[PDB]
Amino acid sequence: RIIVVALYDYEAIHHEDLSFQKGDQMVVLEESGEWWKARSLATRKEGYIPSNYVARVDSLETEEWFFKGISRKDAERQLLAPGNMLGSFMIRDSETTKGSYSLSVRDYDPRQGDTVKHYKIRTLDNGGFYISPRSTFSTLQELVDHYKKGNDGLCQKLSVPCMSSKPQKPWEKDAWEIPRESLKLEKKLGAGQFGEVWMATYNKHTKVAVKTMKPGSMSVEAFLAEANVMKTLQHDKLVKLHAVVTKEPIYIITEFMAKGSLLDFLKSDEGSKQPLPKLIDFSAQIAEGMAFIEQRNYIHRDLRAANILVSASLVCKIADFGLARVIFPIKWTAPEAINFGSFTIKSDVWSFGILLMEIVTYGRIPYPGMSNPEVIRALERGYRMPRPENCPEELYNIMMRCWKNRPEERPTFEYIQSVLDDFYTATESQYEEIP
């Protein structure tokens, strides 16, 4: 008899899902992925619930100060986000010491500004926890309560648990292929050589984005084969692919990203006010996405600012990945790909380097004043874009390393992500050691 508890409020919008408040306890009848079958102890109704809205009773995830599956860098992004303050803290699973927990706290110093510091919580052998050997606790709550009443060697006294947001509600069960009737395409956002992008609505309840592919040479059968591969590339830094309409003209359904393209965003009022370490954080998120793609042995083929999407909370997401294998931007293209049509993860690295320049120049066109063929002649001479005023010297070396003539001499996304994530932090300073 498994009993779980709700971490957030949820309001049913489908036929057989259940509504509940945060705190409600439910009996698990069937575990089966994103949707579970349960019975609400408050209403006695049987139905479906999102598995990621609940957790077993009195387990760690029930606690407000606990955060599951958060990397050290995710913790720092989450803590430095609005609504938090000094002593804002979180306990989370260790990224480097698997099976163990780490503590992250919001801090300040005038030389650097607001920061996040990290402490490793060492699990005892008796079953206790400590950051400092001088001080040991029986429960993580005991740990928390203590450092909440005084610094006792930390950088800050613990104030309030980090801000959390409700996760995305999962897509309807077994609704991969959908009939056009489910969609109301309410506003066109973009139109191009190959189709349009629309802000839409799925069954009156969910906001989505729809990509309408004009019936090109694109084999229906061959597209959908690749779409089923794309469906398996689920990562927080790639746009969420929800569904598909199977008859020409083919429709593609993704999550809606409120702030549209990174290119348009950088060129807006709010974009123009982003400081440089924010621009660098964007870069790092994108590198994270590409490292995942690299990991899975995949190729993007069209990396640039216009194919990156921005969420309302400024999370960056890679879009249009691999879509070009199925179906201009030579200024983003590596020579081996231009001359010989050779497309690799290495040629993407070249593209990422150009995107970096796009980002740091707030969206400015690459090789300005130059035409495409002018640009081609220049490269084969050894020309490279110069360093703009605001770009730091070490950021520039990364771009330059991205623009090596020989593909093999280009670094990996794994390495790039790692550099960019800790651009302002020395390796020795990642964690804190307290006596």
Ligand X SMILES: COc1cc(-c2nn(C(C)C)c3ncnc(N)c23)ccc1NC(=O)OC(C)(C)C
Any idea which residues carry the catalytic annotation?
302
User: Per the annotation, does 322 bind a ligand?
Assistant: no
Q: Is 195 annotated as a binding residue?
A: yes
> Using the rule CB under 6 A, is 319 a contact of ligand X?
yes
Please tell me the distance from the alpha carbon of residue 4 to that of residue 255, in angstroms, as a whole number: 28
Candidates 8, 367, 423, 431: give the one binding Ca ion (CB under 5 A).
Answer: 431
Is 433 in a helix, a strand, or coil?
Answer: coil
Q: The tokens of 35 are what?
A: 């949707």
Point out the residue whose Cβ comes nearest to Cl ion: 27
415 binds Ca ion (CB under 5 A): no
Q: Kindly state whether residue 309 participates in binding ligand X, applying the rule CB under 6 A.
A: yes
Q: Considering only CA atoms, which of 346, 365, 257 is closest in space to residue 304?
A: 365
CB–CB of 132/435 below 8 Å?
Answer: yes
**Residue 194 touches Ca ion, criterion: CB under 5 A:** no
175 belongs to the binding site for ligand X (CB under 6 A): no
Asked whether residue 190 is marked as a ligand-binding residue, the answer is yes
* Shortest Å distance, C-beta 72 to Ca ion: 12
Binding residues for Cl ion, rule: CB under 5 A, are 27
Find the helix or strand (DSSP H, E) in which 350 lies.
Answer: helix 345-360
Binding residue for ligand X (CB under 6 A) from 323, 337, 345, 391?
323
* Helix/strand/coil percentages in the chain, nearest 5: 30, 25, 45
Q: Is 353 annotated to bind ligand?
A: no
118: nearest Cα among 92, 85, 100: 92
> Cβ distance 76 to 116 under 8 Å?
yes
Instruction: Determine the interface stretch with ligand X among 94-102, 118-126, 247-255, 341-349 (rule: CB under 6 A).
Output: 247-255
Tell me how many degrees the CA angle 175-36-236 measures, rounded to the nearest 5. Answer: 65
* Binding test (CB under 6 A) with ligand X, winner from 195, 260, 271, 289: 260
Task: Tell me how far, at minimum, the Cβ of 48 lies from Cl ion, in Å.
Answer: 17
Residue with tokens 């964690």: 431
Nearest distance, CB of residue 72 and Cl ion, angstroms: 41
DSSP run (H or E) holding 219: none
**Shortest distance in whole angstroms from residue 387 CB to Ca ion:** 32
- If one asks whether residue 197 binds ligand X (CB under 6 A), the answer comes out as yes
Q: Is the dihedral of CA 407, 412, 415, 420 positive or negative?
A: positive
Distance of CA 180 to the CA centre of its chain: 29
Binding site for ligand X (CB under 6 A): 189-190, 197, 209-211, 230, 239, 241, 252-254, 256-257, 260-261, 309, 319-321, 323
Binding site residue list for ATP:
189-197, 211
Residues that bind Ca ion (CB under 5 A): 431
